[PDB]
Structure 1
Amino acid sequence: GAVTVRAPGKVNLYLAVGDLRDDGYHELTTVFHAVSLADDVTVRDADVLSIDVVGQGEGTVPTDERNLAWQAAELFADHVGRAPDVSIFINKDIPVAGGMAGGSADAAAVLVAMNELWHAGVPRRDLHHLAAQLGSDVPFALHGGTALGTGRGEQLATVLARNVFHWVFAFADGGLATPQVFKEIDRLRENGDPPRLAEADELLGALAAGDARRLAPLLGNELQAAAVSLNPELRRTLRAGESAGALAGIVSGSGPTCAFLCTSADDAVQVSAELAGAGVCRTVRVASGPVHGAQVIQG
């Protein structure tokens, strides 16, 4: 009578940030990529709504209405005309406030788990609409694979990533608040005329060719300059992973996690070991993508 759903962390292979909109979000164009660093969420019927967390953020992560999974349970229950009487257990590998949208993964997982738990038969298009109400990254956590995100990031068009791509992720000592990083890119742009990414075409071509070596120099994230402004030590992490043999390093999302694309699974084993020995980040992970979006794995 429990349903467990796995939802992936993401890395933005490409992230162009536009103007601040009326709604307080920035317009953006991104290429989301789902990776095997995931959260597992177990949902059970219960007498009241509750959340518990182990893994990343075990000491740390709020379990009240601050948690996006709370709001996901309330929203889904309301959609289907029921009370959100479910216990939610989150076993987290996605770093907290790390740029990989772990709270969004958890919220996506709750939608899918409650759908199955209750056999509510709510369709993908409707789960997508609910996800978009919860946050800009929640729809991608439902969708998974690799996708072109537009609008605020909630509008998705699937793209082909025609291989397995091999990653090392370097978790930082702390976290960054996503709104501070967007404020900082705005500040940097008020001040100067920093470089903007080219169009996504070439990067999308490299993905469709399945070619990590071609993809690597095309990766780019316009928030990286903001994350590095706030946390300049991330330059040491980027430099270390690259020197260890990564094809490329980029900050993931709003940071401060650093992502390193490698040529093969064996290459990532080597890069992760060298990076762990370098003394420049908190802890290191190996992963691959693309992986599926939020999916039931038990129950």
Structure 2
Amino acid sequence: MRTQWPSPAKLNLFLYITGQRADGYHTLQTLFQFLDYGDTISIELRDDGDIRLLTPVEGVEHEDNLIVRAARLLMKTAADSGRLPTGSGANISIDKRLPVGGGLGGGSSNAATVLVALNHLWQCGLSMDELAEMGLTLGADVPVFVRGHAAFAEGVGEILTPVDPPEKWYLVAHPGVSIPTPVIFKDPELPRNTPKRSIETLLKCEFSNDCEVIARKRFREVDAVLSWLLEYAPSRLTGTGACVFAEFDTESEARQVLEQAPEWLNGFVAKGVNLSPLHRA
């Protein structure tokens, strides 16, 4: 039997960099919300203990793909604690709508959906905390997707406090540039001193993304897309870019602006979701 599993995008509704730890990672205060939009992952169990991603993701080698890494991590962890039924395997295919990169968390959402689906399908019985703990080793973006709720996130992104932001409609645009996430976080001029504040202060302050100034300055493609959207609606970078979103109250306004957008916006429209489509499923 084949099962299908949502792998939604996320948005950083705001993103503040509070410092940088010794291991190079940055401490932050950010607010995750999911989008009801993303990839679909299909899984067929194998009985020969193998893991096969049948549908390649362009530019990513099989063994580098977060789908496969997540599956093998779960297999190793379950097997080291006697929770992996003999022969547990899987064929995995993905219908990929999300960009590879851009600050939408698509690869990390793929990792999270695979952890959750395989834990269920192999009957490994691992808890949320254990999965989120294993997800974190695959990237700081992975735990929010594993836990499945919109959340105020601190630490490096793993300290998650569920919250229910307004579920606005978003136009999400992908500038035609690839920004390696290491670039932004290694910039001298990135704010690393933004004062840590309470959720109440943050939820009342205007939402911004501390990384936007740098993405905009360094990538004219990002500045172009942001400048264009800002004429229509509040608009900000998500993640470290390059994607930018514009916030709307209704689907019709968001789609009307989208119908107007030049093709170089590479835009789609989707609704915010405080419960991940994966956990809804």
Q: CA deviation at 1:197?
A: 7.5
Conserved? CA contact 2:4–2:40, under 8 Å: yes
Conserved? CA contact 1:3–1:117, under 8 Å: no
Counterparts of 1:49-128 in structure 2 under 5 Å? 49-53=51-55, 58=57, 60-81=58-79, 82=84, 85-128=89-132
Q: CA deviation at 1:25?
A: 0.7
Counterparts of 1:194-213 in structure 2 under 5 Å? 196=194, 199=197, 200-205=199-204
Q: CA deviation at 1:138?
A: 0.3
Counterparts of 1:159-238 in structure 2 under 5 Å? 159-161=163-165, 163-184=166-187, 187-189=188-190, 196=194, 199=197, 200-205=199-204, 218-238=206-226
**1:22-77 deviation per Cα after TM superposition (whole angstroms, max 9, x unaligned):** 222111111111111212111222343222447xxx5x241422211221111111
Distance, in Å, in 1 between the alignment partners of 2:247 and 2:196 is 20
Which stretches in structure 1 are left out of the alignment for 5+ residues? 206-216
| Residue in 2 that maps onto 1:30 | 30
Pick from 249, 262, 284 the counterpart of residue 267 of structure 2: 284
Root-mean-square deviation (CA, aligned residues, Å) is 2.4
Q: CA deviation at 1:198?
A: 8.2
Closer/same/farther in 2, CA of residues 34 and 220 from structure 1, 3 Å limit: same
Conserved? CA contact 2:135–2:142, under 8 Å: yes
Conserved? CA contact 1:12–1:31, under 8 Å: yes
2:104 counterpart SS class: coil
Q: Number of residue pairs matched?
A: 272
Identity of aligned residues (%): 27
Distance, in Å, in 2 between the alignment partners of 1:166 and 1:203 is 21
1:106 counterpart SS class: helix
| Residue in 2 that maps onto 1:254 | 240
Letter in 2 for 1:188: E
Q: CA deviation at 1:107?
A: 0.2
4+ residue stretches of structure 1 with deviation over 4 A? 193-198
Closer/same/farther in 2, CA of residues 157 and 256 from structure 1, 3 Å limit: same
Distance, in Å, in 1 between the alignment partners of 2:208 and 2:246 is 12
Q: CA deviation at 1:262?
A: 0.8
Conserved? CA contact 1:105–1:294, under 8 Å: no
Distance, in Å, in 1 between the alignment partners of 2:150 and 2:195 is 19
Letter in 2 for 1:157: T
Letter in 2 for 1:37: Y
Which stretches in structure 2 are left out of the alignment for 5+ residues? none
2:173 counterpart SS class: strand
Conserved? CA contact 1:168–1:286, under 8 Å: yes
Q: CA deviation at 1:194?
A: 9.8
Q: CA deviation at 1:133?
A: 1.7
2:227 counterpart SS class: helix
Pick from 139, 143, 164 the counterpart of residue 139 of structure 1: 143
Check if 1:274 corresponds to 2:257. Answer: no
TM-score, with normalisation over the residues of structure 2? 0.87
Letter in 1 for 2:273: P
| Residue in 2 that maps onto 1:157 | 161
Q: CA deviation at 1:286?
A: 0.4
**1:77-131 deviation per Cα after TM superposition (whole angstroms, max 9, x unaligned):** 1121147732221212221111111110000011111112212222222211111
1:136 counterpart SS class: coil
Q: CA deviation at 1:251?
A: 0.8
**1:143-169 deviation per Cα after TM superposition (whole angstroms, max 9, x unaligned):** 3332111111011010122x4311000
Conserved? CA contact 2:102–2:178, under 8 Å: yes
Q: CA deviation at 1:291?
A: 4.5
